[PDB]
Structures are given as structure tokens and as C-alpha cells.
Structure 1
Amino acid sequence: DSLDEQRSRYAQIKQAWDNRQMDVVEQMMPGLKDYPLYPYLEYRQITDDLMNQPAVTVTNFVRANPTLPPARTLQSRFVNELARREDWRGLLAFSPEKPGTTEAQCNYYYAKWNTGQSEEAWQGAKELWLTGKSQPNACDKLFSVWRASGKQDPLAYLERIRLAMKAGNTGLVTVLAGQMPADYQTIASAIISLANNPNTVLTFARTTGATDFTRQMAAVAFASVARQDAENARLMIPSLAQAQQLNEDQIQELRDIVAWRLMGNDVTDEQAKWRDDAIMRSQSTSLIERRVRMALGTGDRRGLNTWLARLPMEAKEKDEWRYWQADLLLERGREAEAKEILHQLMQQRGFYPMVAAQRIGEEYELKIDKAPQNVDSALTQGPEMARVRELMYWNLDNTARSEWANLVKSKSKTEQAQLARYAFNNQWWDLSVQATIAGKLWDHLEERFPLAYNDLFKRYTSGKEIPQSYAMAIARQESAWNPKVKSPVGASGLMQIMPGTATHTVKMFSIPGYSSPGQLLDPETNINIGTSYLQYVYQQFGNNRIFSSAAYNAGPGRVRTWLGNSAGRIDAVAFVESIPFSETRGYVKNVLAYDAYYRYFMGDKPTLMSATEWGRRY
């Protein structure tokens, strides 16, 4: 036998198993015991008949496979199975300690109650209860018996309502209030009305006694009202403050809430004056920063000076604010002071340090820490690494990611760097990036920005205007090089392409061969469709990477709106910094920094922006 022969038998047994040709599977299983992925086959066998498995079989498998990710998840999964059988005694015998998942924990504590450990059951129940998030259905029976025992503090019940409201879980707020303990029955209907429609907030505030609870509940509803109609909320502050006898801090929180909603281009002069007075009296760093961004997005020089100075000392430490302080100083003619800030920034890593270098006409110096010369350690010669190798061979990147996660966890920085380089040397691009993240090896640039799928990116950008380095930067930001990753909303693969976008792109470009979103998990297909959409937004916005990156993340419509807002009054850096969506602003900064890294590794000059991008009016 050999690893090569085992590989063929492995693919063949899975093919048989998928077809339920169990006579073939039964005959082949024993012969695969020496293959690294045999534990995955055992896991499949055990789980295939989980409802009839004795606990001893599961316990033996879990103990025999301490580093196998699915053996670890099987512990909580089997706890849930024992709960399904109502085998409470067995559940605790199988899992004497609190399990890993929330659902398994709900069942563990219910098992404790069933086996006479009420005090312990209630301690667990309370911990699971104190969250605004909706918990597993398994916890319902636990919360029910907990309340039935008389040991559930009514204050804990009311606290969950507050947490649910703050989390925006109005459905849970309503369910809880509908089953309100007698202690607070008098405000139940009012709470249900508030969760149903936040516009009942002033009525809620006037008809209930003002307490820390009702004030916090009203403040959340008030924020919802402001999101719908900022003016209605602004005008309500005096009445709300009077109805609940709000203190200065509470009134200022209400002012902050409204000010956040008066950041649009549409605001009246009366509203803008009120907003700025509110921000002047604010303690909110994020609100002041949003106001600074408004000044940057409109070319307001006096405003930038005024608002940057209102930031607390701590916020002024941020890269962006140090650069904009330098920008103000340069205009004021304070060359030395400004350039010292820029030179200090250049010593650092990232977007602003690169902006700083381009601003003063100096070449940015990339700090590149190297991994050890010797990458071979016990960690690269063990059974877990052998499983990783097989998983990568079969392109099972998501499964490999879980194994790799265990391998890099709790290791020294040196070991994590060796593992990153070992992955890099084997062209396991996603694993290389994953290891740099685990070890926070931020300056190990080569391993953080591998030349992944180089030939494919070259081929698919040769007939387009988007640079190869740029397409690679976008993919690096989107997937961290894992071709099999899918987001919760369905974005898929290397360039995180949404099914709708793929369909629309294939029609617009007359691309052949695409019939299902599942094809987006294939590297070439993904690069083909993704480079096509990227090229589309690139040409649409005049071959400008700031616009195409923003359009790829937020859609062309949003970029048009943003450009209509700045209206040609600002520079490239001010346009990036003033993008109102924090996610898109960060995305653009990352992609531009990554494109420079890619250009460097491809042998080109890593200047942050082209002369055209740098000098254009935004």
C-alpha cells in the first residue's frame, strides 16, 4: 500500500457512500485505517446512525481523536442526541462537564435539574438567560422549569427585556412582556406597544413611572424613531426629558442620537446649527469623528480645524487624525511640524503611512520580517499536519481551515511563523494567511500576501484594464485566499461574488458556461466572473481604484451618491476618509494598501495611488 493508493480508495469509498452502496463501503473501510483521513470516515459512520449509538462508542471516538475538529463538535452533538432520547442520567455520564455549544449547555443544565441538581441548574440557566439574543429552542424547557421553581429573580426577568430591547430583538421583548411576572404586569402592555412601534415612545414615557429601566427602554425606542424621522425625534427631546425627569447625561445621549441622523446632505440650516451645538456638548468620540468626516467630505477647512480639535486626546493618536493634523499644519505653513508627523507615520505599516510617503514625495519603505530559515518542526511532521495535507490535496479548504486552526492555536510566535511559511511553501495560500493572523505576524508581508492563483489572475486580466495586482488585492481582501468560503448572505469564493451579481455579470459580458452559484467555488470560474465585474465598475468610474473598490463593496449607486455629495471639492484621501459606511471605508483602505504590497511582490513600485487618482478632484 501507499499514500497514493489510499488516496484513490478514499475518493472511491466516498463515491460509493454517497450512492449508499454500503456493501462497497463495508468492504473498503478496514483497508483505509492507515490513511490520514480515516477518522473522518469513522465520524461519518458514527453519525450515520447517531440515534442508535451507545454512548461508549462516542466516548471512545472522542477520546481517540483529541485534535480532530469533528470529534470535538461531536461532544456537543451527542449531548443533544442524549437530550432527544430524554436520557438525562446518560447525558451527564457522557458529559459531566459543561459542553461547548449553547444548545448543548441548555440541555446539560436541564439534565442537572432532572437529576436533582436544581441549584446548579439555576446557576446555568441564569447565565444562559442574561442575553438579548434569542437562545436555542432547547433552552425553553430549562427557562420554564427555572421560573416554575420560584428561584428566578424577577429583576433577572426584567433585565432580559432590557437586553433584548437594546439588541433590537423586539420579538423577544414582546414574548417576554406577554409572559410578564405579576411584579411588572402593570407595564407589560406599554412595553409590547413600544416593541411593536417605537413611535409610542412619548406615550410610554408619560404613562409609566420613570426609572432606570423605563428610561433605557425609551432611549432605545427614541433611536428607532430618529432613524425613521430625525426631525420628529429632535423636536421630541424636551417632552421626553420632562416626562422622565432626565438628567444632563441622559439628555445629551438623546442629543447624540439625533445628531447622528443629521449628517446627510439634505439638512436645513436650523438642523445643522442644532446638530453642531449638540456635538459641541457631546462626549461621544465616534460622533465627533463622524462630524470630522463631514468636514473632510465637503472641503470645509475651518470645520476640519474646529472638529479635529474637539476629538479627545486618545482619538488623536489614530493614523487618520495624525495625517489630517499634518494636512492642516502644512496649509498653515508649519512645514517642520507637519513633516515630522508624516515621517513618523511612514515608519508604520498601512494605508496612512503610505499616504504620508506619497504626500511628501518619498518612497515608502516596506518592513518585511522573514520567517525562520528552518520551517520543519515536530508540528509539521505529525498526524494533524498529515490530515491537513490530505484535506488540501482534495481542495477541502473549509475542513482544512478547522484543522489548521487547532495546529496554530496556542503556539509560539516562532512556531506560528514556521507554520505560515510551511503553508506558503506548499502553496496553501489560505493557510499561510490564516497562520499570520493567528500569530499576529503583521510584518511578515510575504506570507500575508502570497501570489495566489498567479497564472489565472494574469490570464483573466490580460485583456482587461484592471491591473493583475489590483484583482489580487480585491480577492485577498474578500476571501483571504480561501476559494471555498461563503458568507452568511451567500457571497462565494475568492472574490466573494453574490449569485445575483454573477448572473448579471454573465449576461452583461456574454460569458459562457455558467449555470449555478455552486460553480463560484471553483477558482477559475470565480476569477473569470469576478474580474469581469471588477473591470465593469473600474471602466464605469474612469479607471479609478478608489471608486471601483467602493463600488465592488457597496454598489455603483452608493458611489454615485457619495461623488454627488463631495461634488469635486475634495482630494483623494479626503474622499476615502469621508466615505460614510465604515465597512466600505475600511475596505477601500485595505485594498489600496494590499495592491501596493502585491505590486511590490510582483517587482513593481508600490506607490499608493496613480498620478491620476492622486490629483483628481473628488
Structure 2
Amino acid sequence: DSLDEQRSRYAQIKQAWDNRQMDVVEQMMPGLKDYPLYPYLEYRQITDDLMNQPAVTVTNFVRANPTLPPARTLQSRFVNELARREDWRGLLAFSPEKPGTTEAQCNYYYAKWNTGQSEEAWQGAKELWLTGKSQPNACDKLFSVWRASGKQDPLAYLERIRLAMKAGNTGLVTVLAGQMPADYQTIASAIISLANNPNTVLTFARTTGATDFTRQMAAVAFASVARQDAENARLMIPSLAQAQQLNEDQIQELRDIVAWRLMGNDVTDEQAKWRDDAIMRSQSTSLIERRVRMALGTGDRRGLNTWLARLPMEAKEKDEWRYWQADLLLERGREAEAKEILHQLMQQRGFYPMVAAQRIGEEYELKIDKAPQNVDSALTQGPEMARVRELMYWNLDNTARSEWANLVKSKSKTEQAQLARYAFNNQWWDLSVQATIAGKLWDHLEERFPLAYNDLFKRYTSGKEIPQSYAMAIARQESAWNPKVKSPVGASGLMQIMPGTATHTVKMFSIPGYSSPGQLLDPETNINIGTSYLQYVYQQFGNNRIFSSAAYNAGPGRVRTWLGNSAGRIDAVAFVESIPFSETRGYVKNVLAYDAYYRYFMGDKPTLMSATEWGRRY
């Protein structure tokens, strides 16, 4: 036998298994014991009949496979199965210690109650209870018996209502208030009315006794009101402060909430004056930073000087604010002071350090730390690495990511760098990036930005205007090179393409052969459709990477709106910094920095922006 022959038998047993040709599977299983992925076959077998599995079988499998990701998750999964059987005694015999998942934890504590360990059951219940998040259905029975015991502190009950409200979990706020303990029954209806409609906040505030609880509840609803109508909330502050006898800090929080909603282009002069007075009296760093961005996005020089100065000392340490301090100093004719800041920025890694270099006409120096010459360690020769090798061979990147996560975890920086280089050497691009992240190897640029799917990117950009380096930068930011990754919202593959976008792109470009979003997990298909849409927004916005990256992330419409706001009054850097969506702003910064890294590894000059992008009016 050989690894090569086992690979064929492995693919064949999975094929038979998928067809439920169990006679073939039973005959083939024994002959695959020496294949690295045999534990995955055993796991599938055990879970196939989990409802009839004795605990001893599960315990034995979990103990025999300590580094197998699914063996680790089987612990919590079986705890849930024992709960389903109502085998409380068995659950604790199988899992004497608190399990890993929340659902399993709910069942673990209910098992404790069922076996006479009430005090311990209550300690766990309270810990699972104190969250604004909706917990697993399994916890319902636990919270119920906990409350029925008389040991549930009513203050803890009211506290979860506060947490739920803050989390925006109004459905939970309502359910809790609907089952309100007698202690707080008098305000139950008011709370339900507040969660149902935040516009009842003034009524809520006036009809309930002002306490820390009602003040916090009202403050959350107030922010919901400000989001729907900033003026309505602005005008309500006096009455709310009087209704709840709010102190200075509490009144300022209300001012901050409204100020956040008056950052639009449509604000009146009265609203703008009120907003700026509120921000002047604020202690909120993020609010002041948003105001600075408003000055940057409108070309307001005096405003930039004023608001940058209002930032607390700590915020002024940030790369962006240091650059904008230098920008102000340059215009003031303080060359030496400004250029020393820019030179200090150039010594660091990132977007601004590269902007600093281009600003003063100096070539940016990439700091590249090399991994060790020898990457072969005990970690690269053990059984877990052998499983990683097989998983990657079958293109099971998500499954391999979990194995790799265990392998790089709790390792020295040296070992994590060797693992990154080992992955890099084997062209396991996503694993290479994953190891650099785990080890925080930020200056190991070669392993952080591998030339992944190079031939495909070249082929699919040769007929387009978007640079190959640019398409790769976008992919790097989107998927960290894992072709099988999907976001919570459904974005898929290397370029994180949404199903709707793929369909719309295929139609717009008359691309053949696309019939299912599942194909987005194929590297070539993903790169084909992704480079197509990227080229679309690129040409639509005049071959400008700031606009195309922002459009790829937030959509063409948002970019048009932002450009209508700045209206040709600002420069490239101010446009990037003033982007109002933090996700898109960070996305653009990362992509521009990554494109420079890719140009470098391709042998081109890594200048941050083209002369056209750098000099254009925004």
C-alpha cells in the first residue's frame, strides 16, 4: 500500500458513502486505517448513528484524537445528545467539566440541577443569563427551574433587560418584561411599549421613577429616535433631562447621540451650530474624530486645525492624525517640524507611512523580515501536519484551516514563522497568511502576501485595464486567499462575490457557464467573475483604485454620493480618510497598501498612488 493508493480509496469510500452503498463502505473502512484522514471517516461513522451511540464509544474516540477538530466539537455535540435522551447522570459522567459550547453548557447545568447540585446549577445559570444576546433554546429549561427555586435575584432579572435593550434585542426585552417578577411589575408595560416603539421615550421617562435603570433604558431608546429623526431627538433633550433629573454626564451623552446624527450634508445652520457646541463639550474620541473627518471631507482647513486640536493626546498618536498634523504644518510653512513627522511615519508599516513617503517625494522602504532558513521541525513531521497535507490535497481549505489553527496555536514566534514558510513553500497560500496572523508576524511580508493563483490572475486581467497586482490585492483583503470561505451574509470565495452580484455580472459581461452560486467556490470561476465586476467599477470610475475599491465594497451608488459630498474640493488622502463607513475606509486603506506590496513582489515600484490618482480633485 502507499499514500497514493490510500488517496484513491479515500475518494472512493466517500463516493460510496454519499450514495449510502454501505456494503462498499464497510468493506473499505478497515483498509484505510493508516491513511491520515481515517479519523474523519470514524467521526462520520460515529455521528451517522449518534442517537444510538454508547458514551464509551464517544469517550474513546475523543481521547484517541486530542488534536482532531471534529473530535473536540463532538464533546459538546454528544453532551447535547445525552440531554436529548434526558440522561442527566450520563451527561455528567461523560462531561464532568463544563463543556465548550453555550448550548452544551446550558445542558450541563441543567444536568447538575437534575442530579441534586442546585447551588452549582444556579452559579452556571446566572453566568449564562447575564447577556443581552438570545441564548440557545436549551437554556430555557435551566432559566425556568432557576427562577422556580427562588434563588434568582430579581436585580439579575432586571439587569438582563438592560443588557438586552443595549444590544438592540428588543424582542428579548419584551419577553422578559412580559414575565416580569412582581417586584418590577409596575414598569413592565412601559418597558414593553419602549421596546416596541422608541418614540414613547418621553412618556416612559415621565411616567416611571427616574433611576439608573430607567435612565439607561431611556438613553438607548433616545438613540433609536435620533436615528429616525435627529431633529426630533435634538428638541427632546431639555424635556428628557428634566423628566429624569439627568446629571451633566448623562445630558452630554444625549448631546453626543444627536451630534452623531447631524454629520450629514443636509444639516441646517442652526443644527450645525448646535452640533459643534455639543462636540466641543464632548469627551467622546470617536465623535471628535468623526467631526475631523467632516472637515477633511469638505476641504475645511480652519475646521481641520480646530478639531484636530480637540482630540485627546492619546488619539493624536494615531498614524492618520499625525499625518494630518504634518499636512497642517506644511501649509503653515513649518517644513522641518512637518517633515520630521512624515519621516517618522515612513519608518513604520502601513497606508499612512506610504502616503508620507509619496508626499515628500521619497521612496518608501519595505521592511521584510525573513522566516528561518530551516522550516523543518517536529511540528512539520507529525500526524497533524499529515492531515493538513491531505486536506489541502483535496482542496478542503475550511477543514484544513481548523487543523492549522491547532497547529499554530500556543507556539513560539519562531515556530509560527517556520510553519508560515512551510505552508508558503507548499503553496498553501491561505495557511501561510493564517500563520502570519496567529504569530503576529506583521513584517514577514513575503508570507503575508503570497503570489496566489498567479497564472489565473494574469490570464483574467490581461484583457482588462485593472492591474493584476490590484486584482490580487482585492482578493487578499477579501478572503486571505481561502477559496472556500463564505461570509455570514453569503459572500463567496477568493473575491467574496455575492450571489446577486455574480448573476448581474455574468449578464452584463455575457459570461458563459454560470448556473449556481456554488461555482463561486471554484478559484477560476471566482477570479473570472470577480475580475469582471472589478473591471466594471474600475472603468466606471475613471480607472481610479480609490473609487473602484470603495465601490467594490460599498457599491457604486455610495461612492457617487460621497463624491457628490466632497464635490472636487479635496485631495486623494482626504477623500480616503473622510469615507464615512469605517469598514469601507479601512478596506480602501488595506487594498492600496496591499497593491503596493504585490507590485513589489512582482518587481515593480511600489509607489502608493499613480500620478493621476494622487493629483486628481475629489
Cα shift at 1:306:
0.1
Deviation string 1:87-110 (CA, Å, 9 cap, x unpaired) is 000000000000000000000000
1:258 Cα deviation after fit: 0.1
Q: 1: CA distance between counterparts of 2:523 and 2:549?
A: 21
Q: State the partner residue of 1:103.
A: 103
Q: Secondary structure at the match of 1:514?
A: coil
Q: CA deviation at 1:501?
A: 0.0
**Could you tell me how far apart the structure 1 residues matched to 2:391 and 2:67 are?**
15
Cα displacement string for residues 434-490 of structure 1 (whole angstroms, at most 9, x for unaligned residues) = 000000000000000000000000000000000000000000000000000001111
Q: 1:398: how far off?
A: 0.0
2 CA distance for matches of 1:602 and 1:395?
26
Q: Deviation at 1:278?
A: 0.1
CA distance in 1, matches of 2:488, 2:156: 32
Question: Deviations 1:331-382 (Å, cap 9, x if unpaired)?
Answer: 0000000000000000000000000000000000000000000000000000
1:232-261 deviations in Å (ceiling 9; x for gaps): 000000000000000000000000000000
Mapped partners of 1:268, 1:340: distance in 2: 40
The alpha-carbon deviation at position 169 of structure 1 amounts to: 0.0
**Cα deviation, residue 325, structure 1:** 0.0
Shift of 1:519: 0.1
- Within 5 Å, which residues of 2 pair with 1:344-359? 344-359=344-359
* Structure 1 unaligned spans of 5+: none
Question: What is the alpha-carbon distance in structure 2 between the residues aligned to residue 89 and residue 374 of structure 1?
Answer: 52
1:65 deviates by 0.0
Task: Provide the C-alpha distance between the structure 2 equivalents of 1:522 and 1:581, rounded to a whole number of angstroms.
Answer: 30
Shift in Å, 1:326: 0.1
Map Cα deviations across residues 191-227 of structure 1 (whole Å, 9 max, x no partner).
0000000000000000000000000000000000000
- Measured in 1, the distance between the counterparts of 2:434 and 2:138 equals 34
Q: Distance in 1 between matches of 2:303 and 2:249?
A: 26
Identity of aligned residues (%): 100
Q: Distance in 2 between matches of 1:268 and 1:182?
A: 48
User: Shift in Å at residue 127 of structure 1?
Assistant: 0.1
Q: CA separation in 1, counterparts of 2:535 and 2:215? A: 52
- The C-alpha deviation readout for 1:40-94, integer Å capped at 9, x for no partner, is 0000000000000000000000000000000000000000000000000000000
CA distance in 2, matches of 1:491, 1:315: 34
C-alpha distance in 2 between matches for 1:47 and 1:101: 18
Aligned-partner Cα distance in 1 for 2:144–2:597:
56
Deviation at 1:130, TM superposition (A): 0.1
Deviations 1:252-297 (A, max 9, x none): 0000000000000000000000000000000000000000000000
- Find the aligned partners of 1:105 and 1:569 in 2 and give their Cα distance: 57
The equivalent of 1:284 in structure 2 is: 284
| SS of corresponding position for 1:245 | coil
In structure 1, how many angstroms separate the alpha carbons of the residues matched to 2:115 and 2:346? Answer: 64
Corresponding residue SS for 1:147: helix
Look up the match of 1:517.
Answer: 517
SS where residue 138 of structure 1 aligns?
helix
Structure 2 CA distance for aligned equivalents of residues 80 and 431 of structure 1: 32
Deviations 1:527-547, CA, capped at 9 Å, x for gaps: 000000000000000000000
Deviation at 1:131, TM superposition (A): 0.2
Distance 2:282 2:544 in 1: 37
Matches within 5 A, 1:40-439: 40-439=40-439
Describe the SS at the equivalent of 2:606.
Answer: coil
SS across alignment from 1:133:
coil
Q: Report deviation, 1:187.
A: 0.1
Distance 2:439 2:361 in 1: 34
* Secondary structure at 1:290 match in 2: helix
**Residue 17 (structure 1) aligned with residue 17 (structure 2):** yes
Show structure 2 runs of 5+ residues with no match: none
Structure 2 counterpart SS, 1:152:
coil
- Give a deviation string over 1:502-557, Cα, whole Å, max 9, x none: 00000000000000000000000000000000000000000000000000000000
Q: Quick one: distance in 2 between partners of 1:306 and 1:350?
A: 26
CA distance in 1 between partners of 2:605 and 2:93 (Å): 64
Deviations 1:1-32 (A, max 9, x none): 00000000000000000000000000000000
1:423 is displaced (CA, Å) by: 0.0
1:611 corresponding residue in structure 2: 611
Distance 2:27 2:582 in 1: 57
Tell me the distance in 1 between the aligned counterparts of 2:119 and 2:367: 57
Deviation at 1:412, TM superposition (A): 0.1
Could you tell me how far apart the structure 2 residues matched to 1:579 and 1:489 are?
A: 23
SS at match of 2:441: coil
Deviation of 1:119 after TM superposition, in Å, equals: 0.1
Distance across 2 between alignment mates of 1:538 and 1:199: 43
- C-alpha distance in structure 2 between counterparts of 1:583 and 1:52, whole Å: 47
CA separation in 1, counterparts of 2:387 and 2:15? 20
**Structure-1 separation of matches of 2:162 and 2:470:** 47
Partner Cα separation in structure 2 for residue 176 and residue 443 of structure 1:
50
Q: Give the superposition deviation at 1:597.
A: 0.1
In the alignment, the residues of structure 1 paired with residue 369 and residue 407 of structure 2 have an alpha-carbon distance, to the nearest angstrom, of 22
Cα deviation, residue 591, structure 1 = 0.1
How far apart, in 1, do the equivalents of 2:417 and 2:17 lie? 39
Which SS does the other structure have where 2:137 is aligned?
coil
SS state at 2:297 partner? helix
- 1:33 is displaced (CA, Å) by 0.1
Q: How many residues align?
A: 618
| In structure 1, distance between residues paired with 2:175 and 2:316 | 45
- The TM-score with structure 1 as length reference comes to 1.00
Cα distance in 2, alignment partners of residues 548 and 466 from structure 1: 10
Task: Supply the distance in 2 between the matched residues of 1:594 and 1:150 (Cα, whole angstroms).
Answer: 59
